[PDB]
TrEMBL record, chain D:
Pfam families: Tubulin (PF00091), Tubulin_C (PF03953). GTP binds at residues 11-12, 97-99, 138, 141-144, 176, 181, 204, 222, 226. GO terms for molecular function: GTP binding; GTPase activity; metal ion binding; structural constituent of cytoskeleton. The keyword Cell inner membrane does not apply. Residues 246-383 form the Tubulin/FtsZ 2-layer sandwich domain. Keywords: Cytoplasm, Cytoskeleton, GTP-binding, Isopeptide bond, Magnesium, Metal-binding, Methylation, Microtubule, Nucleotide-binding, Ubl conjugation. One of its GO terms (biological process) is microtubule-based process. This is Tubulin beta chain. Mg(2+) 1 binds at residues 11, 177. Gene3D superfamilies: Helix hairpin bin, Tubulin/FtsZ, C-terminal domain, Tubulin/FtsZ, GTPase domain. Its cofactor is Mg(2+). Mg(2+) 2 binds at residue 177.
Length: 332, 437, 54, 428
């Protein structure tokens, strides 16, 4: 009988993973501060990696990668991409971004470019077209914020003239295999897109909670991959795999291969895996852009069952065996 | 030349002292009876090995060493062992009842009755020194003597020898080899009381040495004899600069200069490679690049931790064997482009390199194979703080219930010294985090 | 890149390679701790002998 | 050297005491003559812990034989190893205690106790560094109970800085001489809680159940119970008598086993379980030694470990076996059952190994557990006590020797408290 603990109770994904584990008959759940665990579904802040891998007679595994925050925190992602030769400076797939502090100089270098050439000059934190206007947001909050080029020409769906972002779930196992769940989701905007005034909230930003038209064109404002692939065929004469997914697989591979030296647990005394949420923006010419990477992501209500079962098959049961694949392996 | 006196306290300290002095003799060609044919200056000299050995008129080379334990069993093995003749009997100091794995009994109750005797025996070696450098103190964190008596000795050495450096080789407690359930208590108490009295301390986690013996020596359940001969190898490469001709770390003062920019953060991480089994029928001898690369794999460290998630303040490479600077710089050039080596912003990103052409020695019929070249890396990384976190958490788990605390109060300690020690640990962890993020 | 302070001898050599530049209690008080603790022990022993005398 | 002074008091104390010296003398290669005709020098390296060396390089047990009636002691001298003991260490009265704690502790025992302490003193003064004392006794009789505790009180007065350790046989209606044993046990436990560092709770209830259910004996004797006691007593003292990686003494054992001073009552356990005479021909595999040694059916105190939690555990493996397998099996037991080991004492199970097995076994395992489930034994005694005390029944036997009802009320309260304290750490 294998043994695990649960140190983050907000986890919808790993709430469903401990259920599946317990319902195997081969996994016991201990008290969250019991050191003699095989597997740790750990907290999100100040996870004590230093105490992993020092229990003799126990192979220990954890559902987070130490150092992975470098991708999943808006400020460091921008830093990582500009400084790492594996990506920097200008990779075709990241929006020109700058890091700002409320206690800035290079931002104004390209901003003074983008108004005197009439080029599009909308940016984001939140949104507007004048630089100093959004510093009121930056300065009355008190945190380090990132100012990023707003993608003024996105790809809208019909009927609806709606806006969207693509979320892809990626699982990285203890061997550093990169598994991309075959089921992505299109978080959609219900109310039409309007490029006139950028303070109309609901229609420019596509967070699922920031839309509570909720359910007009499809349940929950979620468009699975089958329906979106069909739409691209009928409307634009192309597939999801060719127009969009090749670029998504390329970006996921590039991001995670970049940090592999800093976070891999191949020779470590404890082992890591982590589920990620890559959020992409597709523009007018079927061009994929990376927005953010999410370290503790949630799954759509439909795909919970299937994705969490594959977390077990691929990341947990591979290390602790018991007794078709839903993942596409991104090879390296 | 300037002499160094070694002090071995408790079982771990004494047994590791045997290991080291056996090895020192084989490296300097000193025989078990103390004779050294290579030495042509009879009765004295200012040679480099004279830092660790005095000379009798009869040609005998005697360690500038003292062995102290609160209990005769272990030092009795030195008195009758292969190196029986090596040691003046006044350097082997034993008591009658040990500290029973209790820091307070070692520090207060029993320590107070032997401390003056030990300092007089230490004073008798110091009076044979033309320019004493300082002390090297070997001891366990976990033993009652190793913790309790070392602590009190360290305070006294500060008053009697305030202008002399003190280095530790400290054995950090590991359950696979530990002998007592209270070793976290002892570790925290003795680190607190000793911290201001040690200039540089090399921690050796018995868990790291155990797995290295299992993994790279194919020893199913390592003995102390297995662990200590490996440890002695690491200690030898750290002290070699004091015992041989060279330009790098020639005196104890230079260890602090090169390795410890801040006084409290004086725990450098040791990494050693290659560790190859003697029973291996076929070995492909590892290159300068291969062994320098091993220095950045956690599995070769004296303490398991991940230096990728900390910052460096200093880093020395001590090579022994067939090594030339051309190959070191070539290897360093490759490693930095393929590894996460980040220094504090207030330190240069550089390696201080020392090379001794004599390849490492191995004790005949030991577990280590003879290799063409070897390296010990000394890096001072915030990553080591993981060990303080591990130790402190175990301390917190028992001290929340006051478990076993009665054994210490009963020897004269006050409960408050537990919390004072723990707060200093808390301060130490916060210092490492400031420097390292 | 830069190799400096190269010193050689018959036993070996040493040098420094840079890759990037930067950016006490007394004897009196010790005796007054050891004796404080022996006092505290002798008190605990005396409370015990007194208890056993009852 | 670090010498232990052994004291056996009363009928039970002397009968298990004699078998102990019988068993460990065989293990160390000493014959009834007192001569050493062994084979290995690993038997002599710490022979001093329990033996002195008299003229003619003869080994004499550092033991004191104490009783208020001379009969059982004469039986010991008449016994197999009886001539090994020093005759001056036999200290007997003639009255007897009548299974009455008051006569042992207050009246008849008071006369004799100074003579015992004269012999104890003589053995102590010959010791290089005395670690402490071992007492063998029952709690339900009169001498071992009443006088044994009076001795412990006086030994502590004259040697307050030495360890006092006992093998205390707890009474049980299934093996019961007298109705008053719950009175005697309760009075004695109050003394053990205050004046010993380590007590092995040897439960006659457990020894009877083991002989009946497991060993398939239908009408067991004290000789069948004492067979299990000698095997346990041999096991728990192995790390004192033989050299090992641990080199252990009575004080280190108390330091590591006793997180709180009053909770120093250990459950011993033994595997494999052996009945006298018939020898088992198959050696157990290390996985089996481990499973049996933690089994409730192998515990010498009739408590269920699943009704409490282990504060600390000590284990001794004896035989020629793989300590790689021993370390994996012991880790297996804590990892698969971590629920029954307190979170707040890290790494609270410690294992030793000795190459020399006990006579008759090719491999054996001895278990010393400080479990909060030991409350069940004291609750049992308290229940039996209150059933009589509520009616002041049989109390005249005791007020007739000068005791007050107050003293009974006090002793009962303290053992109730001992129960509450064990329960407080079961929930933590
Ligand atoms: N590496 C190594 N560790 C040792 C050795 N001997 C003991 N230890 C470790 O030291 C700790 C126990 O401290 P000891 O040195 O045995 O005890 P002591 O200093 O003699 O003090 P007391 O026995 O308590 O009076 C445990 O963690 C052991 O694993 C040794 O020879 N080598
Ligand atoms: N450069 C950019 N250009 C165009 N739209 C952008 C953009 N940056 C962000 N957005 C829009 O805002 C949303 C993405 O912002 P962001 O990714 O930072 O949200 P978030 O981190 O708060 C929630 P989650 O982590 O689940 O994705 C989308 O609606 C996206 O269209
Ligand atoms: N296990 C065991 N229990 C005994 C033995 N002799 C007596 N007892 C128990 O001890 C109690 C009687 O005490 P006893 O030792 O005869 O009284 P004492 O001689 O006055 O100290 C009862 O609980 C008996 O069951 C024995 O040899 N072995
Ligand atoms: C739970 O941590 C323990 C537990 C016990 C002990 C120690 C630590 C340290 C040494 C003393 N000690 C022991 N002493 C004896 Cl006599 N026998 C055994 C058998 C196993 O450990 C024994
Ligand atoms: Ca000379
Ligand atoms: Mg986010
Ligand atoms: Mg010791
Ligand atoms: Mg009787």
């Amino acid at each position: 009988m294998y043994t695990f603990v649960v140190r983050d109770e907000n986890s919808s994904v790993y709430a469903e993973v401990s259920r599946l584990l317990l319902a195997t008959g081969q996994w016991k759940r201990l008290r969250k501060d019991n050191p003699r665990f095989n597997l740790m579904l750990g907290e999100r802040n100040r996870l004590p990696f230093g105490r992993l891998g020092h229990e003799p007679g126990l192979v220990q595994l954890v559902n987070y990668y130490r150092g992975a925050d470098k991708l999943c925190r808006k400020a460091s992602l921008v830093k990582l991409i500009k400084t790492s030769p594996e990506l920097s400076e200008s990779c075709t797939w990241f929006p020109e971004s700058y890091v700002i502090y409320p206690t800035r100089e290079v931002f104004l270098a390209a901003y003074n470019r983008r108004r005197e050439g009439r080029e599009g000059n909308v940016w984001i934190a939140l949104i507007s077209s004048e630089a100093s206007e959004l510093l009121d947001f930056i300065d009355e909050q008190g945190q380090v914020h990132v100012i990023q080029k707003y993608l003024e020409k996105p790809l809208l769906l019909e009927p609806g003239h709606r806006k969207f972002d693509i979320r892809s779930w990626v699982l990285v196992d203890h061997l550093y295999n990169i598994y991309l769940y075959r089921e992505g989701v299109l978080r959609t905007s219900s109310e039409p897109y309007n490029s006139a005034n950028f303070q109309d909230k609901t229609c420019h930003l596509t967070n699922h909670c920031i839309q509570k038209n909720y359910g007009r064109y499809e349940e929950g404002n979620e468009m699975f991959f089958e329906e979106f692939n069909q739409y691209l065929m009928d409307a634009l004469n192309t597939t999801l795999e060719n127009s969009i997914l090749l670029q998504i697989k390329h970006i996921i591979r590039s991001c995670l291969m970049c940090i592999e030296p800093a976070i891999s647990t191949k020779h470590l005394h404890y082992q890591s895996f982590q589920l990620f949420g890559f959020d992409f923006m597709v523009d007018e010419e079927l061009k994929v852009w990376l927005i953010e990477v999410n370290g503790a992501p949630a799954c759509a209500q439909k795909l919970y069952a299937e994705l969490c079962q594959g977390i077990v098959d691929v990341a947990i049961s591979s290390v602790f065996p018991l007794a078709t694949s839903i993942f596409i392996k991104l090879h390296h | 030349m300037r002499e160094c006196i070694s002090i071995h306290v408790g079982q771990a300290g004494v047994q590791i002292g045997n290991a080291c002095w056996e090895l020192y003799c084989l490296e300097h060609g000193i025989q078990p009876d103390g004779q050294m044919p290579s030495d042509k200056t009879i009765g004295g000299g200012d040679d480099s090995f004279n830092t660790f050995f005095s000379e009798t008129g009869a040609g005998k080379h005697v360690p500038r060493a003292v062995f102290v334990d609160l209990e005769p069993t272990v030092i009795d093995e030195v008195r009758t062992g292969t190196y029986r003749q090596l040691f003046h009997p006044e350097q082997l100091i034993t008591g009658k009842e040990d500290a029973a794995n209790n820091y307070a009994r070692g520090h207060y109750t029993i320590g107070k009755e032997i401390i003056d005797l030990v300092l007089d025996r230490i004073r008798k070696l110091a009076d044979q020194c033309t320019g004493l450098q300082g002390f090297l103190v070997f001891h366990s964190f976990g033993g009652g003597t190793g913790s309790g008596f070392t602590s009190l000795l360290m305070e006294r050495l500060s008053v009697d020898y305030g202008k002399k450096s003190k280095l530790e080789f400290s054995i950090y407690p590991a359950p696979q080899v530990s002998t007592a359930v209270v070793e976290p208590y002892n570790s925290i108490l003795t680190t607190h009381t000793t911290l201001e009295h040690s200039d540089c301390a090399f921690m050796v986690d018995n868990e790291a040495i155990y797995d290295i013996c299992r993994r790279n020596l194919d020893i199913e359940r390592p003995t102390y004899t297995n662990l200590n001969r490996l440890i002695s190898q690491i200690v030898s490469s750290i002290t070699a600069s004091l015992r041989f001709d060279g330009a790098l770390n020639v005196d104890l003062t230079e260890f602090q200069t090169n390795l410890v920019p801040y006084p409290r953060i004086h725990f450098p991480l040791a990494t050693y490679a290659p560790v190859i089994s003697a029973e291996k029928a076929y070995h492909e001898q590892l290159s300068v690049a291969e062994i320098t690369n091993a220095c950045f794999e956690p599995a070769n460290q004296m303490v398991k931790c991940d230096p990728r998630h900390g910052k460096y303040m200093a880093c020395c490479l001590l090579y022994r064997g067939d090594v030339v600077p051309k190959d070191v710089n070539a290897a360093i050039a490759t490693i930095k482009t393929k590894r996460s080596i980040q220094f504090v912003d207030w330190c240069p990103t550089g390696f201080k390199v020392g090379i001794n052409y004599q390849p490492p020695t191995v004790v005949p019929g030991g577990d280590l194979a003879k290799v063409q070249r070897a390296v010990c890396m000394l890096s001072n990384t915030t990553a080591i703080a993981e060990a303080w976190a591990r130790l402190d958490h175990k301390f917190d788990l028992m001290y929340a219930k006051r478990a076993f605390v009665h054994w210490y109060v009963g020897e004269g300690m006050e409960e408050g010294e537990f919390s004072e020690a723990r707060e200093d640990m808390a301060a130490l962890e916060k210092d490492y985090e400031e420097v390292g993020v | 890149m830069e190799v400096i302070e190269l010193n050689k001898c018959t036993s070996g050599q040493s040098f420094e390679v840079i890759l990037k530049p930067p950016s006490d209690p007394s004897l009196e008080e010790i005796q007054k701790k050891l004796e404080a603790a022996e006092e505290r022990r002798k008190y605990q022993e005396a409370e015990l002998l007194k208890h056993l005398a009852e | 050297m670090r010498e232990i002074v052994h004291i056996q008091a009363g009928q039970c104390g002397n009968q298990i005491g004699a078998k102990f010296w019988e068993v460990i003398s065989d293990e160390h290669g000493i014959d009834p003559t007192g001569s050493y005709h062994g084979d290995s020098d690993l038997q002599l390296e710490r022979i001093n812990v329990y033996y002195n060396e008299a003229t003619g390089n003869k080994y004499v047990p550092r033991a004191i034989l104490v009783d208020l009636e001379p009969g059982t002691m004469d039986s010991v001298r008449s016994g197999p190893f009886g001539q090994i003991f020093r005759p001056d260490n036999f200290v007997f009265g003639q009255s007897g205690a009548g299974n009455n704690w008051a006569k042992g502790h207050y009246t008849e025992g008071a006369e004799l106790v100074d003579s015992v302490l004269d012999v104890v003193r003589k053995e102590s003064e010959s010791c290089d560094c005395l670690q402490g004392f071992q007492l063998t006794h029952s709690l339900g009789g009169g001498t071992g109970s009443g006088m044994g505790t009076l001795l412990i009180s006086k030994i502590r007065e004259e040697y307050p800085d030495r360890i006092m350790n006992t093998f205390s046989v707890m009474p049980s209606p299934k093996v019961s001489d007298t109705v008053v044993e719950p009175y005697n046990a309760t009075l004695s436990v109050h003394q053990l809680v205050e004046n010993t560092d380590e007590t092995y709770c040897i439960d006659n209830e457990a020894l009877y159940d083991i002989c009946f259910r497991t060993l398939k004996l239908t009408t067991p004797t004290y000789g069948d119970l004492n067979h299990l006691v000698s095997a346990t007593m041999s096991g728990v003292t192995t790390c004192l008598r033989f050299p090992g990686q641990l080199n252990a003494d009575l004080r280190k054992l108390a330091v590591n086993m006793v997180p709180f001073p009053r909770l120093h009552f250990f459950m011993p356990g033994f595997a494999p379980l052996t009945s006298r005479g018939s020898q088992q021909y198959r050696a157990l595999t290390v996985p089996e030694l481990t499973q049996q040694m933690f089994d409730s059916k192998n515990m010498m105190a009739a408590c269920d470990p699943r009704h409490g939690r282990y504060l600390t555990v000590a284990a001794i493996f004896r035989g020629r076996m793989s300590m790689k397998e021993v370390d994996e099996q012991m880790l297996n037991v804590q990892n698969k059952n971590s629920s029954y080991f307190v979170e707040w004492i890290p790494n609270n199970v410690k294992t030793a190994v000795c190459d020399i097995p006990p006579r008759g076994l090719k491999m054996s395992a001895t278990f010393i557990g400080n479990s909060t489930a030991i409350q069940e034994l004291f609750k049992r005694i308290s229940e039996q006590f209150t059933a009589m005390f509520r009616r002041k029944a049989f109390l005249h036997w005791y007020t007739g020797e000068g005791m007050d009802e107050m003293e009974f009320t006090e002793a009962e309260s303290n053992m109730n408290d001992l129960v509450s304290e064990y329960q407080q750490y079961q929930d933590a």
